Amino acid sequence: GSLTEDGLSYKEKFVVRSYEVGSNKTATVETIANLLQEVGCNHAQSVGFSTDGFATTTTMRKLHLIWVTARMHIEIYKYPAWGDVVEIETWCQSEGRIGTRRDWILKDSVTGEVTGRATSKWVMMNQDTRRLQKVSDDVRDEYLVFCPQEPRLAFPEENNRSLKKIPKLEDPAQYSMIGLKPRRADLDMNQHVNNVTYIGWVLESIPQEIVDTHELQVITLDYRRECQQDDVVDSLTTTTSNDSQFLHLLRLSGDGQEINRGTTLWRKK
Amino acid sequence: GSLTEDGLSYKEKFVVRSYEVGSNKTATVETIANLLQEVGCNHAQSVGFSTDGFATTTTMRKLHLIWVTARMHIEIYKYPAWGDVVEIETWCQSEGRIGTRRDWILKDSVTGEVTGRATSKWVMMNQDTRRLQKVSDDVRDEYLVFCPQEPRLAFPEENNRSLKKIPKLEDPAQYSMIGLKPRRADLDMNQHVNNVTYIGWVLESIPQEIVDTHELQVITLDYRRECQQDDVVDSLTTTTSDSQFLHLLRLSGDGQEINRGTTLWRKK
Numbered sequence: 015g016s017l018t019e020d021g022l023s024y025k026e027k028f029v030v031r032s033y034e035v036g037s038n039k040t041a042t043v044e045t046i047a048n049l050l051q052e053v054g055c056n057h058a059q060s061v062g063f064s065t066d067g068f069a070t071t072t073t074m075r076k077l078h079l080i081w082v083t084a085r086m087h088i089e090i091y092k093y094p095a096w097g098d099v100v101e102i103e104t105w106c107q108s109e110g111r112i113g114t115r116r117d118w119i120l121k122d123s124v125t126g127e128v129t130g131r132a133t134s135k136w137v138m139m140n141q142d143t144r145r146l147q148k149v150s151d152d153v154r155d156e157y158l159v160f161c162p163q164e165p166r167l168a169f170p171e172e173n174n175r176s177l178k179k180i181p182k183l184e185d186p187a188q189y190s191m192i193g194l195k196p197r198r199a200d201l202d203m204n205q206h207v208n209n210v211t212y213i214g215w216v217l218e219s220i221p222q223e224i225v226d227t228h229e230l231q232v233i234t235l236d237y238r239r240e241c242q243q244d245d246v247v248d249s250l251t252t253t254t255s256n257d258s259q260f261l262h263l264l265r266l267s268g269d270g271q272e273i274n275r276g277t278t279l280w281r282k283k
Numbered sequence: 284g285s286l287t288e289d290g291l292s293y294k295e296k297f298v299v300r301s302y303e304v305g306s307n308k309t310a311t312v313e314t315i316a317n318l319l320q321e322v323g324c325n326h327a328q329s330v331g332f333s334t335d336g337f338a339t340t341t342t343m344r345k346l347h348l349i350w351v352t353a354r355m356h357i358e359i360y361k362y363p364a365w366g367d368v369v370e371i372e373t374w375c376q377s378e379g380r381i382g383t384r385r386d387w388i389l390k391d392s393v394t395g396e397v398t399g400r401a402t403s404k405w406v407m408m409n410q411d412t413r414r415l416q417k418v419s420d421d422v423r424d425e426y427l428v429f430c431p432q433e434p435r436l437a438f439p440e441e442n443n444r445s446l447k448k449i450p451k452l453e454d455p456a457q458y459s460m461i462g463l464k465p466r467r468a469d470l471d472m473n474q475h476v477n478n479v480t481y482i483g484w485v486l487e488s489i490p491q492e493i494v495d496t497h498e499l500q501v502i503t504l505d506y507r508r509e510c511q512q513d514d515v516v517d518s519l520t521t522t523t524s525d526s527q528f529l530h531l532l533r534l535s536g537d538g539q540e541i542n543r544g545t546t547l548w549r550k551k
């Protein structure tokens with residue numbers, strides 16, 4: 015992969031692997047989310063971020079700060095087939111003192127048509143205390159060197175799905191998958207649960223009949239608290255709806271502490 | 284990925300991804316196992332096997348036959364770092380009427396040095412009845428077209444680890460991880476549990492202390508019975524020792540064996 019000509023965005027191509035695809039022989043939304051995170055890591059490395067797994071700036075290391083995900087939003091028009099080449103372009107934007115945004119466009123390598131788009135919100139956290147904070151002047155200056163200074167949105171529309179408020183599912187849930195736990199393959203190189211794991215866990219409470227007869231079009235996931243290596247998760251889903259819509263809650267199996275909430279939109283094949 | 288000059292083996296290069304590595308920023312044995320499976324599928328495709336995810340020959344489709352894994356054996360000398368290029372060469376061989384073997388050699392793309400090797404045994408199964416059988420004359424003839432006819436072994440050494448008989452672990456186990464369940468990411472395109480998942484389940488019952496202070500050098504896994512999508516698995520481990528362990532996966536309810544294996548670990 016490479017920075018584009020102007021050095022303000024990054025492009026990489028991926029061949030879809032045998033083990034990356036579901037029943038339709040097309041890439042899972044989990045495979046898509048891993049590729050988004052891979053190209054994001056390759057971009058961060060190319061613009062001089064830390065290579066220690068935390069992807070920090072100089073100022074962030076000095077102040078013991080990290081980025082954590084607040085939200086991930088993916089819309090897929092066409093899942094790439096097994097052996098297909100997908101091209102993903104990604105860039106970052108500063109959002110004042112609130113946080114930062116990473117955006118992605120997915121294209122068919124052969125046709126050059128857009129097959130999906132994604133957006134993520136990141137907030138600043140002290141690594142030691144785990145307390146959220148605002149972005150410092152010095153960090154905002156670091157982001158000016160490698161981000162477009164005019165707005166560039168994967169989701170430009172002024173009232174678009176990627177920014178909708180998500181309500182909290184009320185008991186009883188319509189469907190549930192209980193006693194979900196992470197294994198070592200679910201952890202990143204710093205022994206935190208991979209953000210993509212939480213996508214899989216949400217989808218586990220979707221009935222197999224939906225997955226068999228629908229394609230996932232849109233997923234919006236809010237991240238509230240991280241699952242520790244030794245935590246156990248319950249995944250809850252209620253139908254809110256030819257298109258199927260669902261409300262999602264992940265919560266700790268014991269005390270019912272919220273870790274994530276989300277929505278999915280599915281269209282019949 | 285390409286067939287080599289003689290058309291009797293296949294080579295592919297892989298860049299190690301961010302999410303593929305563990306805590307020393309080198310590829311997990313699970314990442315290695317997924318890459319072995321991927322170059323295996325790419326080779327099968329290049330020599331005219333089915334593209335429906337069952338990777339069958341013409342006479343296998345006629346007879347409703349599939350290959351199932353009996354054994355996977357992997358030895359790693361160096362795990363490739365995050366963003367390193369690993370080159371993997373793979374080939375197949377007939378073992379008379381017993382079954383077939385797929386072998387792999389892993390190389391550092393930059394040095395050309397061997398960083399690991401693996402071998403796997405495959406047995407014929409009727410897809411409908413799930414009954415094991417011998418290889419037909421007609422299937423053995425199909426394998427003559429794309430396999431070396433002289434022996435080529437990733438593990439040549441007569442009486443090597445890759446062919447050792449594995450005993451059944453006796454209760455009580457020294458270590459256990461219980462209530463393991465597959466999710467959709469654990470299934471292949473035909474909704475069978477990915478063979479690599481079973482490797483991860485085996486390793487779940489190794490203490491975090493071992494994984495933190497040792498590197499995995501060798502893993503030998505026998506496959507006895509498939510975990511179904513709605514099954515639950517217990518992973519059991521006992522120290523037999525370098526650290527060496529004996530492994531058992533069994534169904535959480537009735538204790539039906541699904542896999543047994545051994546691991547050998549070297550202090551870092």
Ligand SMILES: COCC(=O)N[C@@]1(C)CCS(=O)(=O)C1
Nearest residue numbers: 050051054055058069106116
């Ligand atoms: C300036 O780049 C930082 C970055 O992208 N780092 C990530 C950890 C967040 C977005 S990610 O998940 O793609 C990888």
Ligand SMILES: COCC(=O)N[C@@]1(C)CCS(=O)(=O)C1
Nearest residue numbers: 319320323324327332338385
């Ligand atoms: C002609 O080769 C068939 C083949 O390789 N097929 C696999 C399914 C078994 C070995 S695998 O796991 O590498 C892929």
